[PDB]
Amino acid sequence: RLIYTAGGYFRQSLSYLEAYNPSDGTWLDLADLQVPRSGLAGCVVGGLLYAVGGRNNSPDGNTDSSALDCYNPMTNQWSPCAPMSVPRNRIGVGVIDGHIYAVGGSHGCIHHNSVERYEPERDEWHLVAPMLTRRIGVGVAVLNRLLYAVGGFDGTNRLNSAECYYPERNEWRMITAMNTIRSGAGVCVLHNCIYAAGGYDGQDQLNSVERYDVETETWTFVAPMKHRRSALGITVHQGRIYVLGGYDGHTFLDSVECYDPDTDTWSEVTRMTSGRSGVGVAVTL
Amino acid sequence: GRLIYTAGGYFRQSLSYLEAYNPSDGTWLDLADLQVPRSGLAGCVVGGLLYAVGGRNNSPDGNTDSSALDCYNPMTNQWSPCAPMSVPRNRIGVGVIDGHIYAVGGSHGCIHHNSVERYEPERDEWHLVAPMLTRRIGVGVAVLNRLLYAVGGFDGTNRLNSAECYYPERNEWRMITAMNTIRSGAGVCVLHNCIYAAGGYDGQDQLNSVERYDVETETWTFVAPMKHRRSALGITVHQGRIYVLGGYDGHTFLDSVECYDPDTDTWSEVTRMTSGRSGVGVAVTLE
Amino acid sequence: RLIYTAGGYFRQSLSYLEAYNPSDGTWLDLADLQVPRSGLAGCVVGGLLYAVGGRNNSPDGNTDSSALDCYNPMTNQWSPCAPMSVPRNRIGVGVIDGHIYAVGGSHGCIHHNSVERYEPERDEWHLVAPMLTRRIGVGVAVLNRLLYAVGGFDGTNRLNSAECYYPERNEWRMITAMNTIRSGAGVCVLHNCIYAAGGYDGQDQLNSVERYDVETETWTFVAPMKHRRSALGITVHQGRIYVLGGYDGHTFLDSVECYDPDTDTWSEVTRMTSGRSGVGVAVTLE
Ligand SMILES: Cc1cccc2c1CCN(C(=O)[C@@H]1CCCC[C@@H]1C(=O)O)[C@@H]2CN1Cc2ccccc2C1=O
Ligand SMILES: Cc1cccc2c1CCN(C(=O)[C@@H]1CCCC[C@@H]1C(=O)O)[C@@H]2CN1Cc2ccccc2C1=O
Ligand SMILES: Cc1cccc2c1CCN(C(=O)[C@@H]1CCCC[C@@H]1C(=O)O)[C@@H]2CN1Cc2ccccc2C1=O
């Protein structure tokens, strides 16, 4: 119903937790984070907003986060949960059967191919076999109960490659690579298709968008975004993809574009309270 | 067929060496050198003639990317110039379908080509076909089932594990399953119905790992790795065995020549070149 | 008022500084550049001529320039200023509120979309919002206190596109693309319209000229130049466009054509002392 936006970066790492209502286009100002982070990811399981990974880029120094904080909408309080095995900045996340998968990310110079799964019942993190490629700024999506790691950065090369995880087999397999090289792109699922919007190809921030159809196994371009952006928040709400903020190789966007798959067009539906990049977003339900 | 050729290469400067290895007796033939020394060129045999395509002449006095096509006749021991390509293509990939030589990718100065063009020996003419989905230099090319596969490479910024397939009749490219490892300047060939990708450079380390693509299952599978790490390696197949020649291992220029037996799944150093080099154009006499 | 021409190329990068007086048709031989340069841009601020960016082709080495040099007409002397953040060969520049905007250009294989502003009173460069497209061989024009970047080459494609900068907002927005693809075209402003003369479309050097009406948002061809040319110097003096030199594929032009917008006709008013391409041109203001 509503769309969260947690953390981000603008001159320093942010603690902003806000919520956008697309029903009437209003910004709800909620409780600020325990610790300011950028590069963190957001997901919602059991009506609880989880803030996974990230990095506190402050004037005093930099610290990559292994912290999992939780926010119940009613109680309006951040409650620290069990931390991950390793810090994960520039993290991507997905969920299968109410279990939060923490994919890739970075801890300083360490670029992760490792993946670990959180159980909200037990408050425990367990590792679930590494990816074929090390991926930071990775985009994660789940379709037909299979988790996809899309694009990212392996420490040297930006990636167009994607790979599919199978929970029942506990196994990774490489799929068809994207047309465009994308690190820090917005990845989500809409109408049985894996969308990949924006990102960074190694030299330019992108506004191009493409989607993977599971039946054909083919990546196809769609209408591009208005503004170029990497490190953008992304989510789906009532059959429409929303993208929030990001970095354009200079400044930090407050723009919020909305994709309509029927007409194949984007439109700037709103603006955030302030410009920021590296936010983590998730729809309420 | 008979002779495994090695053309050009690099050691301190671009080389013009044409040498032929007879794998039956293990002898080396010192043939007529190239008119222009090059590295990053590709080799292929059409009819009964060896073709040297593209590359770069890296000399102390300057660098020049080559658009040249030269044809060697074994009977006369002479190089004859052919019609040049539309653009220079250093670190080029080449494959042969229906007696036509396909020039794939490569670089010209700052330009990294996704373009592809086809040579007709009958007419001595180059013609551009549909370009690749990705710009690739140091790309591996493999011909299988009358389709042209472009594997790995470097787009100017990023090294690639990605691979795509061309359909000559439809004149279009389609993206296939990416490799397990990122490979720039790898040795790519075809051994009974499987596209191999040996060695290469992942952006940090020089690779000795080898993986092969099964067209029907659409999956890459690792096989026995090479003894020595190498990128920019020449490659060919002779009597059901892959031969890899020379390359760059991060500091030295290899003279080593390893041979893969697919039955035993093992590599073995069958011979060594007269001098160590990288970026050679390699081909073999046909069946 | 004098039409300056600095640097250029003929067999190698040139260091010439000459000034054309359009009233009597005389050429002045001024103090040469301290370093020879081609692909540079000229502009005048506060009665001082500035030479920005470019490349010195010896050869070799071939050095792309990040240098800013200030020519003082009262002393006939060049003085070095603070250098740009990066080298910019085939640069475009424009002036807004006494500040020099360095737009695009190349440093080797790097094709810049970055833009930086110079403050003469401080002798400092500062990075502003980068362009939406990377552009080398780009033409720059200033109209209604907005900076327009037109044409060029992004590293892959030769551009017919153009974009407008908004100093107060600090952002770029894409405008209507040109009718013709142009890199190394002469871009200037005359009677509230952006002109784009000559250049290279990927196949041929152009003599066609088109102008952009900002309100209608449409490009319209005008009378073409007599001679085809790319990498041409351009300026506007007293209601008339002047194009200087250039490259046509074979020769290096010494021709100087003059456009009269009332009659819509070009005419060769003078020659340069020697044929050249990639010159930086500017005029004494007012
Ligand atoms: C999730 C993600 C994927 C890919 C890139 C980034 C992010 C998060 C934000 N981020 C970051 O680099 C994080 C914010 C800026 C401080 C460093 C921090 C990081 O991840 O190291 C970059 C984007 N960039 C690059 C950059 C360069 C200079 C200034 C700002 C930015 C920016 O936002
Ligand atoms: C076909 C191909 C694919 C991938 C890489 C290379 C080649 C050809 C040779 N090549 C090259 O870079 C060519 C040889 C060395 C001069 C440059 C030349 C080139 O293509 O620019 C590099 C390999 N490397 C990298 C390197 C660095 C330092 C010294 C040697 C080498 C080397 O062999
Ligand atoms: C400002 C500008 C915009 C667009 C193209 C060029 C310039 C400056 C001169 N320039 C250049 O290429 C510069 C002069 C020639 C040496 C290279 C130099 C450069 O910037 O690369 C080219 C045009 N060319 C191409 C060419 C090829 C051969 C000989 C001369 C020319 C020429 O004038």
Side-chain angles (χ1 to χ4, degrees):
Chain A
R1 193 171 282 272
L2 278 255
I3 299 173
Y4 290 117
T5 179
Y9 180 93
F10 179 76
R11 275 190 275 96
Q12 57 176 45
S13 293
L14 313 174
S15 302
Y16 303 135
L17 177 55
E18 300 175 344
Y20 175 70
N21 197 347
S23 305
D24 63 319
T26 51
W27 281 100
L28 210 62
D29 197 305
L30 311 188
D32 295 3
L33 281 157
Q34 291 268 204
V35 46
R37 326 189 229 167
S38 54
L40 76 314
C43 61
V44 175
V45 191
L48 284 159
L49 178 60
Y50 299 101
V52 196
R55 162 188 278 245
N56 186 4
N57 201 114
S58 57
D60 300 330
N62 303 337
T63 303
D64 296 316
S65 184
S66 61
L68 175 65
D69 295 321
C70 184
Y71 175 87
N72 193 316
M74 192 193 145
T75 58
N76 206 73
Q77 30 124 226
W78 281 104
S79 60
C81 301
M84 292 173 292
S85 60
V86 70
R88 293 179 189 277
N89 180 39
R90 312 243 257 254
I91 195 175
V93 303
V95 15
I96 306 183
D97 309 348
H99 296 140
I100 305 167
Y101 287 75
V103 183
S106 60
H107 175 215
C109 298
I110 302 161
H111 298 70
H112 306 308
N113 61 335
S114 61
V115 180
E116 51 185 306
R117 190 184 69 206
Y118 180 70
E119 294 190 53
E121 301 89 38
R122 299 183 146 284
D123 191 24
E124 284 183 347
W125 284 93
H126 297 138
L127 289 144
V128 305
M131 293 178 291
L132 301 173
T133 318
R134 297 176 177 284
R135 301 176 185 273
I136 88 167
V138 70
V140 175
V142 41
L143 176 48
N144 306 328
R145 313 171 89 269
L146 301 181
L147 175 131
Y148 292 85
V150 182
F153 179 65
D154 69 1
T156 307
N157 312 302
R158 280 77 184 180
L159 310 169
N160 67 329
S161 60
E163 47 185 305
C164 185
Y165 178 70
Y166 300 86
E168 301 294 311
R169 307 144 200 73
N170 197 54
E171 198 188 341
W172 285 90
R173 202 183 298 120
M174 199 76 72
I175 67 167
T176 309
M178 294 185 292
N179 295 305
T180 312
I181 300 279
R182 304 180 187 277
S183 66
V187 176
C188 66
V189 182
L190 173 53
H191 302 313
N192 278 20
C193 292
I194 310 276
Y195 283 73
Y200 185 64
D201 69 350
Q203 96 181 7
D204 297 315
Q205 282 76 20
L206 308 168
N207 59 0
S208 62
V209 183
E210 58 187 309
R211 70 195 180 190
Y212 180 80
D213 189 50
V214 289
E215 298 299 324
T216 62
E217 305 179 15
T218 293
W219 289 91
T220 305
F221 286 109
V222 299
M225 296 184 293
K226 176 82 172 190
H227 302 272
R228 62 252 251 270
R229 54 182 83 203
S230 63
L232 59 139
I234 193 170
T235 186
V236 169
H237 174 262
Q238 289 177 9
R240 314 291 254 274
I241 301 169
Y242 289 76
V243 299
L244 295 77
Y247 180 61
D248 66 356
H250 182 79
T251 192
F252 309 88
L253 315 190
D254 53 20
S255 178
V256 177
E257 305 181 39
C258 179
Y259 182 66
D260 182 31
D262 294 30
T263 56
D264 190 22
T265 40
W266 293 82
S267 57
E268 183 178 322
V269 290
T270 186
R271 280 168 188 278
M272 299 172 70
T273 62
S274 57
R276 62 192 80 159
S277 67
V279 303
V281 310
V283 73
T284 45
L285 245 8
Chain B
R2 182 89 332 103
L3 293 171
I4 293 166
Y5 297 97
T6 169
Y10 179 91
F11 176 75
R12 308 181 186 177
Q13 49 170 119
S14 292
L15 308 171
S16 59
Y17 304 134
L18 180 64
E19 294 175 307
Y21 175 69
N22 189 342
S24 296
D25 61 12
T27 55
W28 279 97
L29 272 37
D30 186 2
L31 308 179
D33 292 347
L34 293 155
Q35 291 295 310
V36 183
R38 342 175 205 171
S39 53
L41 78 168
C44 67
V45 174
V46 178
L49 302 166
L50 175 67
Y51 288 85
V53 199
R56 163 184 276 204
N57 185 12
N58 189 298
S59 64
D61 301 2
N63 301 337
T64 313
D65 295 314
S66 183
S67 65
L69 177 67
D70 291 283
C71 175
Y72 174 81
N73 187 2
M75 302 310 305
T76 65
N77 192 40
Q78 184 175 239
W79 287 96
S80 293
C82 301
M85 294 177 295
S86 62
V87 289
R89 294 181 186 280
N90 182 32
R91 302 144 109 154
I92 194 176
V94 172
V96 178
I97 301 173
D98 196 26
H100 300 138
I101 306 166
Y102 285 76
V104 180
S107 54
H108 176 213
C110 306
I111 305 299
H112 290 66
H113 305 303
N114 61 339
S115 62
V116 177
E117 51 186 307
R118 176 169 57 202
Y119 180 72
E120 300 183 29
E122 305 88 340
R123 324 198 84 262
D124 191 25
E125 278 186 341
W126 285 93
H127 298 293
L128 286 158
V129 305
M132 290 183 293
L133 306 176
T134 310
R135 293 170 180 285
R136 302 177 183 274
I137 82 168
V139 70
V141 170
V143 171
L144 179 52
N145 301 316
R146 300 162 82 254
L147 302 180
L148 194 87
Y149 288 84
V151 183
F154 178 69
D155 65 15
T157 307
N158 315 295
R159 280 82 183 180
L160 312 174
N161 63 334
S162 68
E164 51 186 305
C165 178
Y166 178 64
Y167 296 77
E169 300 296 315
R170 299 178 174 81
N171 190 32
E172 68 178 51
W173 287 84
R174 290 208 275 252
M175 203 76 213
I176 67 161
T177 307
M179 291 183 291
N180 295 311
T181 315
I182 290 166
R183 297 183 191 278
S184 182
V188 172
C189 69
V190 65
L191 219 197
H192 22 253
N193 220 62
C194 288
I195 298 164
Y196 285 73
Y201 182 63
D202 68 352
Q204 202 61 64
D205 294 316
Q206 312 294 344
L207 304 174
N208 64 344
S209 61
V210 183
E211 59 187 307
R212 67 190 178 189
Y213 183 74
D214 184 296
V215 288
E216 295 296 333
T217 67
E218 309 183 49
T219 55
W220 292 86
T221 302
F222 286 107
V223 307
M226 298 182 295
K227 177 58 185 173
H228 298 93
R229 293 165 177 283
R230 53 179 89 206
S231 61
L233 55 140
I235 191 166
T236 188
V237 174
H238 179 268
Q239 297 182 348
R241 286 180 149 104
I242 298 169
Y243 287 75
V244 300
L245 291 82
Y248 182 66
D249 72 344
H251 63 287
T252 56
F253 300 89
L254 308 190
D255 56 20
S256 178
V257 175
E258 298 182 46
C259 184
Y260 181 68
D261 181 35
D263 297 338
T264 57
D265 188 23
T266 58
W267 291 83
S268 57
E269 188 165 302
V270 298
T271 190
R272 69 203 315 100
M273 303 174 78
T274 57
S275 56
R277 62 195 79 162
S278 67
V280 294
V282 167
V284 68
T285 309
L286 299 182
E287 224 301 314
Chain C
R1 299 180 68 185
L2 297 170
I3 294 165
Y4 297 93
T5 177
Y9 180 93
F10 179 68
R11 294 202 261 273
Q12 60 183 47
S13 293
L14 306 171
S15 63
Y16 304 134
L17 179 66
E18 295 171 300
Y20 178 62
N21 191 355
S23 300
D24 60 343
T26 55
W27 280 95
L28 284 63
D29 185 9
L30 308 179
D32 291 341
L33 289 158
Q34 222 74 237
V35 188
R37 286 189 282 170
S38 61
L40 79 170
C43 69
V44 172
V45 182
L48 297 173
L49 173 66
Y50 291 87
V52 198
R55 166 186 273 240
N56 182 24
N57 225 251
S58 297
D60 329 68
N62 300 341
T63 312
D64 293 317
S65 182
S66 65
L68 180 67
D69 296 299
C70 178
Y71 175 79
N72 188 356
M74 301 298 168
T75 64
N76 193 46
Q77 188 175 228
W78 287 93
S79 293
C81 302
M84 293 178 296
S85 61
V86 293
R88 294 179 186 276
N89 180 37
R90 291 136 95 155
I91 195 176
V93 317
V95 177
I96 302 185
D97 199 20
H99 299 120
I100 308 169
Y101 286 78
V103 181
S106 57
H107 176 217
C109 295
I110 302 171
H111 292 60
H112 302 304
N113 60 357
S114 59
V115 182
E116 50 187 308
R117 183 183 60 239
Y118 178 73
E119 300 189 34
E121 300 195 328
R122 281 191 143 202
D123 191 31
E124 277 180 3
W125 285 92
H126 294 292
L127 203 69
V128 298
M131 291 184 291
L132 303 173
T133 317
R134 294 166 181 278
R135 300 179 187 275
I136 87 170
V138 71
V140 171
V142 173
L143 178 54
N144 299 318
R145 311 189 70 244
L146 303 174
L147 191 141
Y148 293 82
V150 182
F153 181 70
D154 66 0
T156 302
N157 302 302
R158 211 163 301 283
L159 306 171
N160 67 331
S161 60
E163 50 187 303
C164 179
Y165 179 62
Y166 296 83
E168 300 293 312
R169 294 174 173 79
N170 191 31
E171 66 185 47
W172 289 82
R173 308 206 192 125
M174 203 79 68
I175 62 165
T176 308
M178 293 183 290
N179 297 311
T180 313
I181 293 170
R182 302 180 189 273
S183 65
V187 175
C188 67
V189 183
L190 175 55
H191 303 326
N192 210 67
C193 293
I194 311 300
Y195 281 75
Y200 187 63
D201 67 352
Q203 296 292 124
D204 299 314
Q205 278 73 19
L206 304 164
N207 59 12
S208 59
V209 186
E210 57 186 310
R211 69 190 173 189
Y212 180 72
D213 185 296
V214 302
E215 294 298 328
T216 66
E217 309 179 45
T218 47
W219 290 87
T220 309
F221 289 109
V222 302
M225 296 181 296
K226 186 177 172 66
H227 303 284
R228 297 171 168 283
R229 54 180 87 206
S230 62
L232 57 140
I234 193 170
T235 184
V236 172
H237 174 269
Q238 215 151 242
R240 284 175 152 85
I241 298 165
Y242 289 79
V243 302
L244 297 79
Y247 177 69
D248 68 339
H250 323 101
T251 65
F252 295 89
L253 284 66
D254 64 334
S255 176
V256 179
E257 299 181 46
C258 179
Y259 181 70
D260 181 32
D262 296 327
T263 56
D264 188 20
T265 53
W266 289 85
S267 59
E268 196 171 328
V269 289
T270 187
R271 310 303 237 296
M272 304 190 75
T273 53
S274 56
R276 63 193 78 162
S277 66
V279 302
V281 171
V283 278
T284 308
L285 300 177
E286 306 184 322

